[PDB]
Structure 1
Amino acid sequence: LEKLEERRAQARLGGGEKRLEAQHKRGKLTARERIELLLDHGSFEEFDMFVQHRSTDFGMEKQKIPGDGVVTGWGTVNGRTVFLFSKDFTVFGGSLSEAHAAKIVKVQDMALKMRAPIIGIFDAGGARIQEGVAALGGYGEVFRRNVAASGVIPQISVIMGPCAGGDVYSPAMTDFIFMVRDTSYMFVTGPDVVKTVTNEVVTAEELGGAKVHTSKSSIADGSFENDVEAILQIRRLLDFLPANNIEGVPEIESFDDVNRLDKSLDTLIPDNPNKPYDMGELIRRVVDEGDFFEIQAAYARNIITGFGRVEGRTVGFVANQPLVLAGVLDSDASRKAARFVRFCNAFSIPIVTFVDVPGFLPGTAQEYGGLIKHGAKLLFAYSQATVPLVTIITRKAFGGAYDVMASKHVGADLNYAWPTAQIAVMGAKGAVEIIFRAEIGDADKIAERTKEYEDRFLSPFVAAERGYIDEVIMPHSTRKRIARALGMLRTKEMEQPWKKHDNIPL
């Protein structure tokens, strides 16, 4: 029947042609266009097109718009099944009522049952007040399902417009949050309430814009120039991730060779012990084809974390960055690396670690800020993991830090070291000042003792003599060795006792 076709075409228009032109004028796409762009061509299957709202208070009963402000369904990306929902800003400002909520909960439940990823695109405007208490009910169910699925399927969230109010909690519990550079923001309470209560006057962009949440607060995993770039990068990322916690990481055919040598690395570390070097070059030299998907690029830059490929399999990389704060560990970097390792471990992805760490960052600010627990988080995440771990100690490891960064003692499988590695309890000066304290008056004798201690102990050979280092390798072979080691470690099988769940510090 053609009357059905007409009704369908009417549902496809949302809140009206005027509001759609206004949406375009701001430089943003419409919900259906975003869906069309993300999924493989011709694959979109839609659910629940005609659902309507059921409220009858405050004169809201006289405007029933089909769709109720969200488009939901499933399709395929590069041949693999995905489920997704997308809020429609043109319909009641994308607000969340009961009937609206039911679609979301349906699609979440189905995605959990069939064990496939979920992609959520947010463009909302908060709670629809006219619905009263019922609104809250809706929120509640959605939250529950998120928590039920955590650690079973990967969930991605993309904020492409305003996202005020309680609804902000729905993306917070997912695995990744991506933001658009100049049109999105997130906050629990808006500028009006801020002004009334505290007398501070701030704009929405200054309160929760992309910059604040990618550089200070740790919420966002990345930013992008506009909608198109964001969606294409999300598509790209999705190919790295395993579908669920049972199957393995995807495999493609690699164009690289496992037997290539890279002579350049012989000169990477400078002779001068103070001048720094760029770790990102080494990482991008060890992955398959110099392709690296960086996570949280702009926040706490003393640490580097991301996904690469080795021999056609995805591998996670964590590494210390000498170019910022001398590569020291602090609370922020600790949390960043800890959460990332937890994800990798949860979905059975192997981990490679590059270590260069002189200690922890001193100062009262860190102590009052809770550095003890924040630092314990990372040790926890490493020591509990049950996937292959490979570590490379490029320049120097010192003190307790050497143990948090995937030490042999905390369960790393293989530990290699370059010849320049300096593994010691602490620096030469401090150690000698502490040991030979009864003769600290002199300056020449102290220099003698310092030289002898430095030459005897600040090397990789004392640590090797105790058997803590599996092999001292030449730098230019590193890639080949890694590629071999991971290959053998696929079969790792260990068993812990029975617990409901751990009690990780928070």
Structure 2
Amino acid sequence: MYSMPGYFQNMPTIGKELVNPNPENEQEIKAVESDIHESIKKALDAGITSEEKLNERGQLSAMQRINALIDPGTWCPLNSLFNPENNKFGTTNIVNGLGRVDGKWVYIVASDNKKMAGAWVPGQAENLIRCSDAAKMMHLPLIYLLNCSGVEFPNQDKVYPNRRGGGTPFFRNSELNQLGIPVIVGIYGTNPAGGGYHSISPTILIAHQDANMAVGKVPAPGSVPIHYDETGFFREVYQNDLGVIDGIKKYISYLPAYNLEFFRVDTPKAPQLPAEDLYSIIPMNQKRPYDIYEVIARLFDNSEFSEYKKGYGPEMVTGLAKVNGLLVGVIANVQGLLMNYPEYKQNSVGIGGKLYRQGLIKMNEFVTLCARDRIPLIWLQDTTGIDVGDEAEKAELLGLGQSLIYSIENSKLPSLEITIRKASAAAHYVLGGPQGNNTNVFSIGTGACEYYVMPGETAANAMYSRKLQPIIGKMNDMIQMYTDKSRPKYCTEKGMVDEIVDMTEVRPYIQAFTEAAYQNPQSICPMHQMLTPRSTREFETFG
């Protein structure tokens, strides 16, 4: 009951059973992961009010609202620790991510009512734009669990004005609507001005009986007697938080969505090798290489993988894989030394994690093929950059990196980026990096990830070279600075990567992304009209 089994089923299998486990490496990754989890716990509990205190007053917390809304085990948080402006509570006062509601993936934004009743705080507008952008790119419904008191008077200058401030999301909600993407808001508590516009901008308004939305024992402006009884802007009103959630569930049940079976090329299948091995496979020792095929084997269905142009551009892996039976294009760095590579140099060894002419061209082609086939791209980054020097320049490397950018921009397909370890240099950008604002929905990273323009020592040796012990002290300060400012938690705090996820969460996020991309795609390529599988086949049989 699937198209072209000859192409899409019984694909080459990859990966080996993990013969030599590494407990110390696993220990190190999990300690990054534990720290992430601990920080999130702390950030979610931070504020001026507790879950307990809110509950007594009649209010669920953001997470209680989310957990009430979603199918169990489907919460994929993003921007959990996003806090670029260093808010004391450690958050942007919203909780956001992907969740599934009776089988339909939705993008969720929940005001954190522990923190000045979900007030605007520095960094929040940016966080919200990342949410609407994800919804836009995926053509995925946006859900607000809204409890927003608007602007705090001390810091209005950082939250009220400007191109990408508190006013942008209301336009972003109109754009979503004009693109045919529904926004659904559950309206809680007092929402004047900023919250009022967050309340009115969505497609569907579900209100709490005690909630209000307004421009700005006299009742709070724009309560239910007004926005239900008079204006009719509140389409439905409910006694309590859970009723509002169930109202939301109801309108979500109304939303268009494919039965994903329509797009499957196979029965969903678990990987053949366990994800827990990733804790041994992906080295915390950034100098150590690993086999990327072992990672791909553990993230994609049945450890199946159909490689595009294997042997050409061996610094990269590009090929098709399946996620819950759905087609994705995977683009992943190869680690390790590459003998007699690259081809434009004599007697040379190539460094895995770097980009050369063939990998760039191979990627350009693959993106373009997947673009045409409407197959979403998942990028697995572990990169140290593009090859440098005049031999690299003559090999067109600069133009090829940019060609890839162009190819990506041309794809107009939702894309996921996963930083396995290193996100560095121009390579981070061109490898479906978060800099492609039209394509990259968001990015995630493992506990083994790190982000920099270039390595600490490279930067230090560069800026201080012209010293031809105190200078060596400045150099090592810079190196440690670069280390400090490239740790997973710091990177996600600045939003360089949207979420640091556990090794056992990577596939789930891939599953969430892929199923959300196929939920209601805006463009289709029938399987029998797909070019990637054919060109892939032809390369294997013709040379």
The TM-score bracket by the shorter chain reads 0.3 to 0.5
Relative CO higher for 1 or 2, CA cutoff 8 Å, sep ≥ 6? 2
- Normalising by structure 2, report the TM-score: 0.43
- Normalising by structure 1, report the TM-score: 0.46
